[PDB]
Design a protein around this nucleic acid. Structure first.
Ligand SMILES: [Zn+2]
Ligand SMILES: [Zn+2]
Lengths: 76, 93, 82, 109, 148, 85, 99, 99, 83, 94, 108
DNA sequence: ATCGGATGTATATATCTGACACGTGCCTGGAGACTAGGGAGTAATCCCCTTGGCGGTTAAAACGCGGGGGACAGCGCGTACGTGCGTTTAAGCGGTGCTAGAGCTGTCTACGACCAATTGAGCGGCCTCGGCACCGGGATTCTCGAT
DNA sequence: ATCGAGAATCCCGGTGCCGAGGCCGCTCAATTGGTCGTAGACAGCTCTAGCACCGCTTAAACGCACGTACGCGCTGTCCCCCGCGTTTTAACCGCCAAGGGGATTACTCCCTAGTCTCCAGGCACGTGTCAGATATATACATCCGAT
């Protein structure tokens, strides 16, 4: 299962995941293959925030899904 | 071309209402236009400041009346206020 | 009701105001003219202040109305609000 | 009013009411504009214009003329007292100055 | 121009007497690009940690502040995930008299204790404020398996 | 007393002071640094952070920013580095 | 025999003293009564905030001080030292207050 | 045998003649050239609308007429009939133009 | 195409005529230089604001409206030129 | 309890501490400074709005405020204020 | 500049950028307010405030005092060529007047 | 005191020319009907602050008197300014030539308005200690009648 | 040119008081993120008029000479503010008491911005004609030297 994610830099990243895999595993894969901690990294699909607690299977994620990645920076 | 608005027709109508025989030249027309614009700007600015100072958001008649009472001297202000009240009363019915 | 209160501005008051103004010698007819001009200025300011406090459907002439009137006349005042 | 004629005619005026209303709305003076404010403003403007024009016409007639020129406007404004205070800082172009000579400068008797 | 002479003089200054626990040097051909290495302070939960960071020098120096970013990942309230550093002395407290040695010393001093006033990340900040033990344990479990 | 050789060095460019200026907070810099600082920096004392905006504006028209006595002392005592500049 | 200063050598002392001072030169109660009497003509039974009276007094004193400065300048121009009502009249005419 | 007026009557006649008329009193080309010189001192390569030059000339003439009225009043105030530089300076000082 | 010493265009008869309109019967000999200085100051003050107004509009010609606006800002409102 | 009233007290005191690190300010002078700040802000904003409306525009960008600052202030204060504002905008953008 | 901090700190200012922006937007000045206007205006206001405060503190120290009073503000305002021109008609409450005696009135 | 030049100003009349007054096509802005939603009118309540009042005590105001300095009128002068006439000059008017640049138009890309959630900057209330106000003592310095 | 005595002002030290700068609790507005209609930046075209040039007048400017009247300095007179001492008045500080209305909150209603559709009011353009400016020729007010 290859999933495309596009960040704010326009880079398309292909990730190998499973429908039963939780978003925690996906975030661990992202931090391993990109070197960015998952605290500031979350997925966007169909205009809905992908909360880390809920798994991918509950979102009906299908083959070759397109995800958006946006960096969030907090004031201070 | 582009249209340029002016109060020339209305000033001419008022002049013909007051003096049926006298005419008016171009320079006096421009002077009247400038005077009308200046008075409009003065009254509108004073009314806006009055509306803002009292935590309001609309310019009703009474703000205009108080602006007129503030700007014009005694007799002119009294006559203008009377005329404005008469016009509003005639308009509302 | 009050009457004949312009005499409250005594001669030493005018003399001290002139002394601050930088005046060394004062004639004897200055005081009446000064009282007249002060009265005129006070009427001019108070009329605008009373109009301002009448517009707001109030009954007490707050200092903000006086500040607004002075600013309108061209004598902006600093310290009492604004 | 009858709510059948034009807005300027309903209020019994000559200056426009729609144009004044639009100028008030688009002039960035307030968020909202009342329904009676433009009528009052137009009435005030019309009265002031009528007063100035009447004075200028009298001045022109006294000078054996039929057309209002800036000189007549300057004379009408200056000779009046209320309008002199209203337009104290205004400089009328091609208007000139009132004729006067100080008493001291006159020839000795 | 003047920036080249200033950079040369200060790299000489760091050469003949480097402060302890701090190293720095220009790896790229351009004098603006620099790298720096800091070892974990003894009085910190980051024991055994080594951190590599990069420094970019703007065109005009020293009147404009330089930019510093940690290449490595560290669990710190004042640091960002991507390595962006939130330090007071860089942007609103920059001064021409400051040098790279001083700013690295300040970075080490704040690595001794995170600033609670203006944290970069709020969740880890409030976790740290909640209890010292949880913050220390989580900082350890991040740093010992990220430093090496 | 004679000023120390350590103190006469400019803190900003580490060069011998040339026509230096003295800030109201008793911090001295050479004028080549000071003139370039004002346009595009915080416009303050670099070691100290003391705003001198009114002081700078008042002195610039008077052209009295440079300290004559301090400049003369180092210029006379150590002319050799001044000449090479 | 008792010591008496020359005419005009103590007026300079008064000028020096009052220019350094910053207090109010007119008394409070007479000015308050005058303000109330002036105001009651336009509308009845007004109530005055004390800050309004204070601001009115400050403005009046500032205006009178400026007017006295200008009229003293006019008197000096007229090759005199005393100030006379015609000096004040000329100053106000030039300033455009009365026209 | 030749007839000439006493000094003073021609001045009064000129005053009466000039106060009655409204024409401009400064030659147009010198004023326009002066305005162009000042503008080019401010910003280089500027072009002027004719109406702008006319407006500047009218404003300057009105201002100078007012200043001369005030100067005449100042000169009369000091038991004189001639206008002198100190009169202009005093008028400008009282008007607040130069302080 | 620069211009040098052009203040002399406001000659003595022009100042005399302006004073005569003002209401002056007798004129001293040092009035003219002071009047020329005052005129230069006033013209500089007005033209500075006019040039600033035409600068903000990314335009290369000063119009009557800019001069009218500058005079209105300076406190001396002008009538008869539009506005 | 009465409603909130906003003022420039904290920022003016911070500027004062930045200028003189050992001098306080009385309340009367504090209110005077607050009134001065309000007056200058209103003047600049009104001039900028008038200038923006004179060119058939609908927005107030930094250009209008800069021109208003040029017009309102004297010869040297205008130059210094323009320099400060240009520096602030440049630092804010990047 | 880097994001993720207060707007008053990105530009290095001390005056509030957000409050100035809100006042400009809700002040009935124009339909739309640009992003760069509040920063520029706040910088100008802060510069003017610092300019006045420095001279006021200098006068206060010259008067053997460590607390700014309105008299020091009047002294600082009227002793500067430009600030006097800017604050022409403004009357400072309890500010007094500058010491000045005409040279003619002085004794001979 | 007016008399008679002598000048300038005011007044009656022909005329013809460009600006004012009026007619016309049309198109852009004003007018008319309907909805919704927020701003404002209105009623009830609190307690802040404004007005009224009395006792003392004392700094300031009112009154009177001696007199010295400055306001003011008159005289004399000589120098700067008005008035007029002949001459050099640059303004003023006409006509033409042209190109910099104001003014209008079509595309569209990026800057700015709107809305929810959120939490930290800023505001209200407390408080305490240090800078400022006041008083008593002494040293210093303008000032004037008499040398 | 000055000495010295009476008097106003400044320095210094000691004591006390209240307001200003710091701290804590807290409610709301500024921040972040995203979405979307639109404005003004830009390239392109037209065509207005501001600039430069020329030649011919003749109106205003310039320089010089003559006289005269008035701006300034001086002298003299006089009278009126100034400075000081004494007496009478109410300002001011403190205190207490009462209540009018400014300020707040809750509820409801109706006024106006927004929308679309329709049409005529005035705006640019054109043309006819007479009001007034120009010139020419009388009639009267006014200024000046002098009996
Ligand atoms: Zn240096
Ligand atoms: Zn320093």
């Amino acid at each position: 299962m290859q999933i495309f994610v596009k960040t704010l830099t326009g880079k398309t990243i292909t990730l190998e995941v499973e429908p039963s895999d939780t978003i925690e595993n996906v975030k661990a894969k992202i931090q391993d293959k990109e070197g960015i901690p998952p605290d500031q990294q979350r997925l966007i699909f169909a205009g809905k925030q992908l909360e880390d607690g809920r798994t991918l299977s509950d979102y009906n994620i299908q083959k070759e899904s397109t995800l958006h990645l946006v960096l969030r920076l907090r004031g201070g | 071309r582009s249209r340029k608005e002016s109060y020339s027709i209305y000033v001419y109508k008022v002049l013909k209402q007051v003096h049926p025989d006298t005419g008016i030249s171009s320079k006096a027309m421009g002077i009247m236009n400038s005077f009308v614009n200046d008075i409009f700007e003065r009254i509108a600015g004073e009314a806006s400041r009055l509306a803002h100072y009292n935590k309001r958001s609309t310019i009703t008649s009474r703000e205009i009346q108080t602006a007129v009472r503030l700007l014009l001297p005694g007799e002119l202000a009294k006559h203008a206020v009377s005329e404005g009240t008469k016009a509003v009363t005639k308009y509302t019915s | 009701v009050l009457r004949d209160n312009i005499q409250g501005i005594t001669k030493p008051a005018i003399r001290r105001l002139a002394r601050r103004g930088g005046v060394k010698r004062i004639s004897g007819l200055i005081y009446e003219e000064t009282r007249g001009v002060l009265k005129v200025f006070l009427e001019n300011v108070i009329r605008d202040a009373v109009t301002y406090t009448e517009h707001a459907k109030r009954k007490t002439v707050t200092a903000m109305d006086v500040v607004y009137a002075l600013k309108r006349q061209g004598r902006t005042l600093y310290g009492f609000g604004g | 009013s009858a709510k059948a004629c034009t807005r300027s005619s309903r209020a019994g005026l000559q200056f426009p009411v729609g144009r004044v209303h639009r100028l008030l709305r688009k002039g960035n003076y307030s968020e909202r504009v009342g329904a009676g404010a433009p009528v009052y403003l137009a009435a005030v403007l019309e009265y002031l214009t009528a007063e100035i024009l009447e004075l200028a016409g009298n001045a022109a007639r006294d000078n054996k003329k039929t057309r209002i020129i800036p000189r007549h406007l300057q004379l009408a404004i200056r000779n009046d007292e209320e309008l002199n205070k209203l337009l104290g800082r205004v400089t009328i172009a091609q208007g000139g100055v009132l004729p006067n000579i100080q008493a001291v400068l006159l020839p000795k008797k | 121009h003047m920036a080249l002479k200033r950079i040369n003089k200060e790299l000489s200054d760091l050469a003949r007497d480097p402060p302890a626990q701090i190293s720095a040097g220009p790896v790229g051909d351009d004098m603006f690009h620099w790298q720096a290495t800091i070892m974990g302070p003894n009085d910190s939960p980051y024991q055994g940690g080594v951190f590599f960071l990069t420094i970019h020098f703007p065109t005009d120096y020293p009147f404009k502040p330089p930019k510093v970013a940690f290449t490595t990942r560290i669990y710190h309230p004042n640091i960002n995930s991507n390595g962006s550093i939130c330090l007071d002395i860089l942007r609103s407290q920059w001064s021409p008299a400051l040098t790279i040695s001083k700013v690295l010393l300040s970075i080490a001093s704040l690595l001794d204790d995170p600033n609670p006033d203006d944290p970069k990340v709020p969740e880890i900040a409030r976790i740290y404020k909640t209890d010292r033990d949880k913050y220390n344990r989580i900082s350890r479990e991040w740093t010992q398996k990220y430093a090496m | 007393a004679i000023p120390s050789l350590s103190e006469c060095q400019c803190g900003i460019c580490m060069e011998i002071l040339v026509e230096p200026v003295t800030l109201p907070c008793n911090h001295t810099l050479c004028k080549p640094c000071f003139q370039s600082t004002v346009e595009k920096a915080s416009l303050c004392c670099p070691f100290c952070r003391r705003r001198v905006s009114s002081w700078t504006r008042y002195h610039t028209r008077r052209n009295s920013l440079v300290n004559v006595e301090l400049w003369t002392i180092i210029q006379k005592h150590y002319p050799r580095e001044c000449k090479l500049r | 025999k008792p010591h008496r200063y020359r005419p005009g050598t103590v007026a300079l002392r008064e000028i020096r003293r009052y220019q350094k001072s910053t207090e109010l030169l007119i008394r409070k109660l007479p000015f308050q009564r005058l303000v109330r009497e002036i105001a009651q003509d336009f509308k009845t039974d007004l109530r005055f905030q004390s800050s309004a009276v204070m601001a009115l007094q400050e403005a009046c004193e500032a205006y009178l001080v400026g007017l006295f400065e200008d009229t003293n300048l006019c008197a000096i121009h007229a090759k005199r030292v005393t100030i006379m009502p015609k000096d004040i009249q000329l100053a106000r005419r030039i300033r455009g207050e009365r026209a």
